């Protein structure tokens, strides 16, 4: 038991939000 | 128990928000 | 128990916010 | 228990905010 | 218990803000 | 007869293409 | 006959392409 | 007959391309 | 017959490319 | 017949490229 995020690959253009793990807070994309 | 984020690869152009781990706060992309 | 972020690689152009770990505060990308 | 950020590599052009760990404050990218 | 940021490498051109650890204040990139 | 574009006002954040008049060429937004 | 662009006002943050008149060429936003 | 661009006002932060008139070439924003 | 760009006003901050008239070449913002 | 750029005013902080007229070459901002 726990939370984890691993081994991913992203390529190209970002203009929004990219987030690995979110435990709280607010994201206006 | 815990939170972690590892071994990821990102390539190219960013104009937004990229975040590994978010525990609180606000992100206007 | 804890929070951690490791071994990631980023390549190219940034004009936004890149953040390893966020525990609070505000990010206007 | 604690917060940490390690072993990451960044390459290329920055015009925004790059932050290892954020515990508070404000970031206008 | 504590906060730390280590073993990262950054290469290329900066015109914004690069910050290891932020505990308060304001960053206009 | 002719082409013209006038008296417009834009306010806020741009991350795409804003073009007054386009007679040819290519725009990847 | 002709092409023209006038009297416009833009305010705030730009991270993309802003172009008055485009007669040819390529724009990667 | 001709091409012209006049009387515009721009205010704030630029991190992209701002161009009055473009007759050819390439713009990577 | 011709190309011209006049009477414009820019205020604030720049980290990209600002160009009055472009007849050729390449811009990497 | 010709190309010209006149009567503009620029105020504030520059860290990129400001160009009146470009007839060729390359601009890495």
Numbering used by the authors:
A (entry chain J), B (entry chain H), C (entry chain F), D (entry chain D), E (entry chain B), F (entry chain I), ...: 14 to 42
Task: Please share excerpts from the published article on this structure.
The Uppsala APP mutation (Δ690–695 in APP, Δ19–24 in Aβ) is the first known multi-codon deletion causing autosomal dominant AD. Discovered in three individuals from a family in Sweden, this mutation gives rise to a dominantly inherited form of early onset fAD. Post mortem analysis of Uppsala APP brain tissue is consistent with typical AD pathology, showing abundant deposition of extracellular Aβ plaques, primarily composed of AβUpp(1–42)Δ19–24 or an N-terminally truncated form, alongside intracellular tau tangles. To summarize, we solved the fibril structures underlying the tau and Aβ pathologies in a transgenic mouse model and a patient carrying the Uppsala APP mutation, the first known multi-codon deletion mutation in the APP gene leading to AD.
Tg-UppSwe transgenic mice express human APP with the Swedish APP mutation (KM670/671NL) and the Uppsala APP mutation (Δ690-695) and their brain pathology therefore consists solely of mutant AβUpp(1–42)Δ19–24. We determined the cryo-EM structure of AβUpp(1–42)Δ19–24 fibrils purified from tg-UppSwe mouse brain tissue to a resolution of 3.2 Å. Murine AβUpp(1–42)Δ19–24 fibrils consist of two identical, intertwined S-shaped protofilaments that pack against each other with an approximate pseudo-21 helical symmetry. The ordered core of the fibril, for which atomic model building was possible, extends from residues S8 to A42 (Δ19–24). The S-fold of each protofilament is formed by two hydrophobic clusters around residues (i) Y10, V12, Q15, L17, N27, I 31, and L34, as well as (ii) A30, I32, M35, V40, and A42. A hydrogen bond between the carbonyl group at H13 and Q15 in the same monomeric subunit stabilizes the N-terminal arm of the S-fold. The interface between the two protofilaments is formed by salt bridges between K28 and A42' of the adjacent protofilament. Interestingly, murine AβUpp(1–42)Δ19–24 fibrils show a high similarity to human and murine wild-type Aβ42 type II filaments, although the sequence register in the N-terminal domain is shifted by six residues. In conclusion, the murine AβUpp(1–42)Δ19–24 fibril is a hybrid between type I and type II filaments, combining structural elements from both. The observed poor binding affinity of mAb158, the murine parent of lecanemab, to Aβ deposits in tg-UppSwe mice may stem from the inaccessibility of its binding site, spanning amino acids 3–8, as S8 is part of the ordered core in murine AβUpp(1–42)Δ19–24 fibrils.
